[PDB]
Each structure stands twice: as C-alpha cells, then as structure tokens.
Design a binder for these strands. Structure first.
Ligand SMILES: CC[C@@](O)(C(=O)O)c1cc2n(c(=O)c1CO)Cc1cc3c(CN(C)C)c(O)ccc3nc1-2
Length: 565
DNA sequence: AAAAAGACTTGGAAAAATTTTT
DNA sequence: AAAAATTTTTCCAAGTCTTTTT
C-alpha cells in the first residue's frame, strides 16, 4: 500500500488529529556494571564504585581520547554532577577528579569495540533480527485512518553533554530518562500504552492541538524534548509542502518588499531604519533572525537581530570596492560567518549611526528584536517570517543555476556535476560550511592514480586504433574496416569511463569545505529537483537516496518536468 | 508587553558494514 | 586472504516561531 496523502483534502486549521494510538517509547537498556578485573583507582589505591557513580565514571572513560576532557569547564561541570551520584562514603574519599584513574576502564571499552567487530555471523544476524522486531512493534503509530512511522522511538541513552562550540554546560550529566518523566499523548478512544512493570507515566494527555506522541523535560537546558512522526508522514510532509508554498508566495511580492525597505532606509524614525537594514541583511546575505538567548546558558552565537557592534567592521574602500562591511561572527552551531560585502551608500551611512556612542558588547540594532521584525513581515504578506527568505533565496538560486549550468548534450555523470555545483551555490549562500574531512582528504591521491591508470588504457587503445587504420590502408577490405570499427568503440568506451572519473574528482574537490545535506533536505523545494530529473532523464535515485525519496514522496509523484518555483 | 514555555524546523563526523584493491 | 577505500547507520543539539504565564 502507498498512501497518497497529497491527493486528499487539506487538513483543517486547529485540530491536528482525531485519532492517535502508539505503543510508547523504547527505553535504553539498563546499565551493566563493570566486571571484576576492570578496576577504578583513586590516589593509586583500588576502589569499587556504586552502580550509580560507576556509570557516570564510564562516560568520562569513553571520552578519554578527546581533548575536551582536559578543559576547565568540562572537568568542573562533570565533577560537580558526578558528586551528586556518589554515596556519602564515596564523597568523603573522592575530593577531586584529577586524583582519579580511568585508564583500565578506557582500555576495556576499546577491547569491547574490538570484540564486537569479531562477532560471528550467527551473533550479528541475531542482533539485527532483535532490532527489526523492535521496529515493527514500537516504530509505528496510528494517526487518522493510517499507519505512519515514528522517527526516533528509541530514547537516547544517558551520557555527558558536550554540545557544539564553546558551550558553558559541557561536561554536565544527561540523566537516564525514566517512565516517570514521560508525558504520553494519544486519543481518548485509543488503547493507552502500558508503562514498564513497576513504573508509571508522568502524565497521559489527550491534546489534539499538538503533533507529538511522547514528551519529557531534559536537565541540561530545561527544555521539552519530543518523539514525533517521521518525515514521510502526512503531518510532517504537508507542513513542508506549505513551507515551500509560502516561499513561492513571497516570490510574487519580493520586489514590492525590496522597494519599500529601500525607501525605509531614508525614514525619519530610527526603529524603521534599523528594521529596514536588518531586512536587507536577511534578504541579500540570507542571515538567520537572531533570537535573544540567556547569557551563560548557551554558546555565544548570534544572528541578524542579535548582532553586536564588534561583529561588523566598516570600510569606505577595500579591494577597490566601495562601501564594504566586513562581517565576522559565529552563527548557528558556532559556524563562522566571514564576508566582505559591498552595500548601497544609504546602508553604510545608516550602519555608522547605529554604531555611534556604543561599546563593543552593545547590540547593533537597539530598539529591535525578532518579534518586531516578524510583526512587520506579517503585515507585508500573510504567514511571512524571517526564515522564509532563506527558503526563498535558496530554492530560487537552485532553480536559476540548474537552468544556467545544465548542458543538453551532456551525459548523466556530467549533469550530476552541474546539479552539485548548483547545490553548492545554495550551500555557500546559506553558509553550510565544513572542515576538510579528517585527513581523509588524501583520498584525492587515490582517485588521481586510478585516473592515470585509466589514461594508460586509453593511450593503449589509441595505439590499437592507429595500427588498425594503418592495416586498413594496405590491402583495403571489408574485414579490416570492421576491426577499425570495434577499436573505435573501444576508445569511445574508455573515453566515457575517464570522463566519469574526472567528473567525480572535480565534484569532490569543489565540495571540500561545503556541506550539501542541510539545504538538500530543508532548504530546496524538491519539485525543482524532480522537474530537473524528469526533464533530462536523470534517475531520481542518483540525486536522492532511499530515506530522502521517502520524505519527498509527494514531490516525486506530484510534479511534472515543467514545474516552476 | 515581555519573559517564560511550548512546539516545531534546521544533519555531519565517526563507526560500522561492505566493497575494492592487492 | 588481508589491508584499504567506500557506502551506510550510529551518535548527539540548536535555532525559529507560536502560545502561555507573570
Ligand atoms: C548539522 C546540521 C544541523 O545542525 C543544522 O541545523 O543545519 C542539523 C542537526 C540535526 N538534524 C538536522 O536535521 C540538521 C539539519 O537541518 C536532526 C538532528 C537530530 C539530533 C538528535 C536526535 N533527536 C531528534 C532524537 C540529537 O539527539 C542531537 C542532535 C541532533 N541534531 C540534529
């Protein structure tokens, strides 16, 4: 069965579902204590830890190879959290982390990882079958007349928080999620999932205004985490289709918005000038609407509305270009945004006024926040927010670049190179940067030797065709002419093979510091890709893998080769 | 309001399983 | 067969925007 939810009458506003039934979450397996021979040492002397304290110790031991375990913040936060898990008898002995020895514990886990890759075919297939039967029973929920898959039904096991970038809470313990922390959401007429025996759920609710099945609060940030349906479901896919339709509606009114914000740079009021400059930044450079965050709780990262004076450096002339704004800051996930961008005269002049009488720690856009900006965007067009510009600019750039880089007469490997260069332009615009693959970038040597070995085969084939043509001169007959034909086809087959290898080598080189995944799955109206694939006869499986094909099932079925964003 | 909460949106590096070279 | 290069799951957070509290 294949449910085409996209052919149904669109789901009404307010209510998300009428019926909802699931078996609840799968809890992480219990902690298995260390055997007798794996010893922990404090001040050089043997010490057996209580299960609760031993568990927290194993987490640090497993991370001993990383440099972050030597960091002040990591160690401070870890030790404070490990103390809470210790008994009173253990707290009187273990005064500090530095006198502790986790070396035997670290070696054991490395030995287990080695003992696991040396498992038998009977053991390997068994664990794979235990995993598959867990997916049949708990990986599916029933939502309104249909069986839909659940994304992450297995709750993440306990461990140590690290986060991304320079996070103030690195080292902290992420405690084991218990049934007592779980809030279940289902309909009043559904069979309520039973908790593990000897346990109870925190709450069983019936809120049809939300899309989640299970929720709980995590101890690091104090936020609510959820278990929702998978990307191939109606509830996720319809909202994704709507996100793209909203981005298409912005397209038909973007010049009208551009002309107004350009005029708003000249306004009498400062709040209107700042709002217009911030809008320009979100449009031209596709910056995220930086929401304000609590200091000392998260890693110091900013976006457009949260930019500080220290994040921009103004230059009247740089590189022979007029009115350059040197952007240098950490955006989402602590990914550095560096750009030297030529702006209009009025923006540069406006930026000099927003930087007047301010200290480096002060906000560039005072009197402005994401709420004020989105309240204005909502008046310009219904349902328009700041992130819609990122979606619009990404999708329109993909469409225009595929239209400009794709050559009709090219073979499939060459067209995939044109597709990837177009996706690359989107990733550069969105700043989806990447650090060169951990050494492993020397796999460019391996590709070059295979290319040089193929250039050898081609050069040998050209010598065969050369002597076949010379043998066709002396004693010209229809038997020697057919040998020249077969040698020409042999040169042709080898030329195509080399072309494919050289195209793959270029693809990897240009993609060294670029991450394509995020724009491909979140930013890029899949219909633009489907339309391109059908137009040039490029099979969809060459662009989207199995999981992406399932998420974008709606676009693959409902989209002609003539679709225009 | 305007903080505080709640509810959605937005992988890539490392492992491991395979596959290919040797 | 055994080392090496690939293709595929496994691990682990952070923003945006909407809705409630204070
Ligand atoms: C790396 C790119 C990115 O950070 C991003 O913002 O551009 C991201 C992260 C994550 N995801 C994505 O789709 C995307 C891309 O759009 C899904 C995801 C799941 C994560 C989970 C799993 N949860 C949902 C159960 C974690 O536990 C920790 C971090 C996680 N990070 C991500």
């Amino acid at each position: 069965q294949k449910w085409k939810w996209w052919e149904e009458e669109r789901y009404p506003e307010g209510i998300k579902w009428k019926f909802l039934e699931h078996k609840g979450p799968v809890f992480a397996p219990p902690y298995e204590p260390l055997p007798e021979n794996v010893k922990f040492y404090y001040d050089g002397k043997v010490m057996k830890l209580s299960p609760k304290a031993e568990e927290v110790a194993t987490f640090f031991a497993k991370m001993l190879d990383h440099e972050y375990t030597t960091k002040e913040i990591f160690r401070k936060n870890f030790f404070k959290d490990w103390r809470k898990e210790m008994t009173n008898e253990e707290k009187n002995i273990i005064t500090n982390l530095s006198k502790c020895d986790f070396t035997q514990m670290s070696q054991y886990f490395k030995a287990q990882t080695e003992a696991r890759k040396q498992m038998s075919k009977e053991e390997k297939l068994k664990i794979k079958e235990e995993n598959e039967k867990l997916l049949k029973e708990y990986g599916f929920c029933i939502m309104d007349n249909h069986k839909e898959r659940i994304a992450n039904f297995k709750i993440e096991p306990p461990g140590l928080f690290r986060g991304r970038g320079n996070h103030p809470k690195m080292g902290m313990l992420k405690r084991r999620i218990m049934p007592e922390d779980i809030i279940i959401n289902c309909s009043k007429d559904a069979k309520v999932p039973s908790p593990p025996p000897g346990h109870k759920w925190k709450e069983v609710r019936h809120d049809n205004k939300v899309t989640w099945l299970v929720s709980w609060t995590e101890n690091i940030q104090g936020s609510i985490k959820y278990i929702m349906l998978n990307p191939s479901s109606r509830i996720k896919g319809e909202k994704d289709w709507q996100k793209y339709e909203t981005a298409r509606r912005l397209k038909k009114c973007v010049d009208k918005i551009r002309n107004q914000y350009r005029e708003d740079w000249k306004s009498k009021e400062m709040k209107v000038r700042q709002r217009a400059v911030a809008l320009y930044f979100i449009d031209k450079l596709a910056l995220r609407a930086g929401n304000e965050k609590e200091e000392g709780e998260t890693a110091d990262t900013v976006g457009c509305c949260s930019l500080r004076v220290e994040h921009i450096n103004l230059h009247p002339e740089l590189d022979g270009q007029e009115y350059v704004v040197e952007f240098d800051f950490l955006g989402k996930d602590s990914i550095r945004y560096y750009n030297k961008v030529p702006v209009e005269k009025r923006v540069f002049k406006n930026l000099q006024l927003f930087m007047e009488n301010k200290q480096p720690e002060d906000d560039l856009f005072d009197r402005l926040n994401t709420g004020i900006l989105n309240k204005h965007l909502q008046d310009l067009m219904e349902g328009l927010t700041a992130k819609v510009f990122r979606t619009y600019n990404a999708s329109i750039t993909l469409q225009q670049q595929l239209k400009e880089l794709t050559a009709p007469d090219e073979n499939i490997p060459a067209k995939i190179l044109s597709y990837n260069r177009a996706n690359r332009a989107v990733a550069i615009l969105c700043n989806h940067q990447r650090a060169p693959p951990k050494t492993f970038e020397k796999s460019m040597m391996n590709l070059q030797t295979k290319i040089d070995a193929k250039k050898e085969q081609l050069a040998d084939a050209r010598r065969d065709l050369k002597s076949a043509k010379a043998d066709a001169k002396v004693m010209k007959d229809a038997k020697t002419k057919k040998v020249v034909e077969s040698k020409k086809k042999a040169v042709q087959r080898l030329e195509e093979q080399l072309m494919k290898l050289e195209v793959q080598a270029t693809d990897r080189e240009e993609n060294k510091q670029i991450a394509l995944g995020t724009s491909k799955l979140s930013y890029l109206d899949p219909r633009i890709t489907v339309a391109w694939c059908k137009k040039w006869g490029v099979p969809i499986e060459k662009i989207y893998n199995k999981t992406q094909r399932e998420k974008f099932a709606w676009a693959i079925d409902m989209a002609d080769e003539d679709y225009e964003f």
